[PDB]
Amino acid sequence: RLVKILLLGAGESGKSTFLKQMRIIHGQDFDQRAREEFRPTIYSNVIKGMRVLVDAREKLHIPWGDNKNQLHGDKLMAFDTRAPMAAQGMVETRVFLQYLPAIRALWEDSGIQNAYDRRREFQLGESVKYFLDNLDKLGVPDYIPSQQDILLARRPTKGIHEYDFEIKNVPFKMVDVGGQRSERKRWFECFDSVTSILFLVSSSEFDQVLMEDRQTNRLTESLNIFETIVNNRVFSNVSIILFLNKTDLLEEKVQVVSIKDYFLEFEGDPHCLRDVQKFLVECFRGKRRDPLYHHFTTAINTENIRLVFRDVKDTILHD
Amino acid sequence: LIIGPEEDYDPGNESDIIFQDLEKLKSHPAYLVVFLRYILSQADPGPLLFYLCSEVYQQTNPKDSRSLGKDIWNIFLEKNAPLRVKIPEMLQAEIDLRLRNNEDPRNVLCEAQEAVMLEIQEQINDYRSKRTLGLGSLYGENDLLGLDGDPLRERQMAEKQLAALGDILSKYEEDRSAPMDFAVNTFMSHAGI
Ligand SMILES: Nc1nc2c(ncn2[C@@H]2O[C@H](COP(=O)(O)OP(=O)(O)O)[C@@H](O)[C@H]2O)c(=O)[nH]1
Ligand code: ALF
Ligand SMILES: [Mg+2]
Structure with missing residues (x-):
């Protein structure tokens, strides 16, 4: 029945x-509370996503759009994706804000972008681009994921x-x-x-x-x-x-x-x-x-x- | 290399070797039943069932297998055969003669079994890829999880597994499920199941 x-x-x-x-x-x-539970996941999608990108730029030997972004690339690679919270795909807001400046710089770099366009050569979900193009709304302190944001969030x-x-x-x-x-x-x-x-x-x-x-x-x-x-x-x-x-x-x-x-x-x-x-x-x-x-x-x-x-x-x- | 965005993936043994060879698959009844569940559900059962029945006939005395030789003929080789398998025309004809004189068919029959081996091996290969897709449990592989290489241990599992094949054997017409059942049990029983 x-x-x-x-x-x-x-x-x-x-x-x-x-x-x-x-x-x-x-x-x-x-509701809002339910949507807030996706925030950690969303911040994690972005940090791990950007990390794959800089690792890809490097290994695919793609040039930096600007060498100064090397230091931001270093900051991101040093993020331990195997630590407790990161392991279960989550990232605190305070920690997310520490990487924001560096992530925003890397996303503007043409080498990073080129690497994104060549994502078929590695593994990367296309929704990381959606969140990277919306870094502005994710960066505000009172950020609450929208319904659309929720649908795009990646949770294996x-x-x-x-x-x-x-x-x-x-x-x-x-x-x-x-x-x-x-x-x-x-x-x-x-x-x-x-x-x-x-x-x-x-x-x-x-x-x-x-x-x-x-x-x-x-x-x-x-x-x-x-x-x-x-x-x-x-x-x-x-x-x-x-x-x-x-x-x-x-x-x-x-x-x-x-x-x-x-x-x-x-x-x-x-x-x-x-x-x-x-x-x-x-x-x-x-x-x-x-x-x-x-x-x-x-x-x-x-x-x-x-x-x-x-x-x-x-x-x-x-x- | 290049890191993945999801590092917590675990792929999850040597059952692999057993599934790629018919000889040993036949010596491991529990594994054979899994493969039969595959065939019966996804493919043409004729080739394997014919091979298995023809196997039993080979290991039986020439004076205690005339009726099995008639069944094999009527179920797999005969013109209106419900589970007709395609074998070389020369082979079909010679097996037809031998039986019509009560001679020893085992020789050409063995050649018929070999000719069908080609399709069986293809099916064995198709199943190996289903295993690679991780769909093994779709055909009963879960009933193998916890099987030490013990002859008696396995024969018991062959039962229960076989006792639950009616599930698939039902999706078939009585005129096809009947001969299939005949064939299945003809080999299983000769395997002490
Ligand atoms: N642009 C786009 N993204 C999608 C679509 N369907 C799913 N996604 C995104 O694809 C990723 C994987 O989807 P998910 O539903 O988790 O996949 P599942 O592993 O099959 O459950 C997520 O980030 C989804 O937002 C779609 O039709 N279009
Ligand atoms: F990739 Al999934 F469920 F997360 F198939
Ligand atoms: Mg899913």
């Missing part, structure tokens, strides 16, 4: 972001998490899980009484490799995971819906990187969002061996998810 929905997808595909949207759109939302997921909610008297239970290889062993514990699977794919990961083994192309991994799921007879009764998430990032990306450089099959305008989206859909549809529903989403955009979930709900209820 309950509509149970499982969120699956490789690491960083946007599962937890979708989860948060369900709470904002159909649940209690996030380990283990299983449930979130119950209702939509017009229908009870929903959504299950969220981690997506890295090591966390997928926990996927089998939830497949019980599952009505539907939402499979998230970061549509803009075609030029990136896995964090697990910096060699396997991300889209390849997503495709293979999907192929094992959709072809498993145990799931013939379950409604699988595909979410080509991060549409906004894909849109930007196709303007500077070509999918042809990573997937030969592509024959069309690599600068055309519509052609890349069609190609991606084809890739996933082609994996089924024997009605595959799909949506292009932007999990960080509440309005988009609101209209997308309405379609999902109708599909599931009618199947």
Whole structure:
């Protein structure tokens, strides 16, 4: 009688972001106190994020936009990411303010920026850019993360998490899980009484490799995971819906990187969002061996998810 | 190198060696059941089931296996075979003759088993990649966590695991699940399970 929905997808595909949207759109939302709890995470995203950047500038031998930024680079690398609080992805406000001047200087440095543009050569989430471009609002002493800030904050997921909610008297239970290889062993514990699977794919990961083994192309991994799921007879009764998430990032990306450089099959305008989206859909549809529903989403955009979930709900209820 | 923004990732043994070779996979019933759960759920069961049944027939006396030779034929090689496997036409024909004269088919049968090995090995390889994706537990690998290399210890786990295969064997049509069950248990029972 309950509509149970499982969120699956490789690491960083946007599962937890979708989860948060369900709470904002159909649940209690996030009051100020709840949003304040994300502050430590947000400050941590930024410090660790900038640290990866200066480490990348160096190792990729990218020149400094200005040598004086070397001293700021030194301050950041000296930050111990293995200390207690940092280990669990958190940073106090007072400590964050000590690194602010240096972080702001580094973000303005063209070498640092160049390194960011070459992030596919290492591992870095694109939301660190969002927070670096908003250092001003993060720096005020009375800063309270906005709803948008909350959706962008990066908190790696380990283990299983449930979130119950209702939509017009229908009870929903959504299950969220981690997506890295090591966390997928926990996927089998939830497949019980599952009505539907939402499979998230970061549509803009075609030029990136896995964090697990910096060699396997991300889209390849997503495709293979999907192929094992959709072809498993145990799931013939379950409604699988595909979410080509991060549409906004894909849109930007196709303007500077070509999918042809990573997937030969592509024959069309690599600068055309519509052609890349069609190609991606084809890739996933082609994996089924024997009605595959799909949506292009932007999990960080509440309005988009609101209209997308309405379609999902109708599909599931009618199947 | 270049540091990661998330340094707390832990990847999480030699079960790897057992899954890549059919000979030893057959000697480790518990592991075999996992692989069968994979095949039955994701692929064409014919090749493996045919191979396993043909194995039992090989290790049985020529005077105590005529009925098993007929079942093998009707389930896997016959024209209307429910779990038809594709083998060389020459092979099909010669096995057909031998049985129609009550001769010793084991030789060409062994060649039929070898020809099917190609697809089985591909499936063995497909499963290894599922393992690499960390989806092992999807097919029962959790029932291996805590297995010392003991023959008797394992045979007990083969049961219970096998006793729970009906779960997958149900998603099938009675005309396909029946012969499958026949095949599965034909080999398992000969393995003391
Ligand atoms: N720009 C953009 N960022 C996104 C989108 N979906 C998720 N993110 C960001 O991607 C990062 C990883 O997402 P998360 O939901 O934690 O991933 P999960 O590992 O699948 O749970 C986070 O910082 C999210 O804000 C999207 O559609 N667009
Ligand atoms: F990258 Al995850 F949950 F898959 F944090
Ligand atoms: Mg998550």
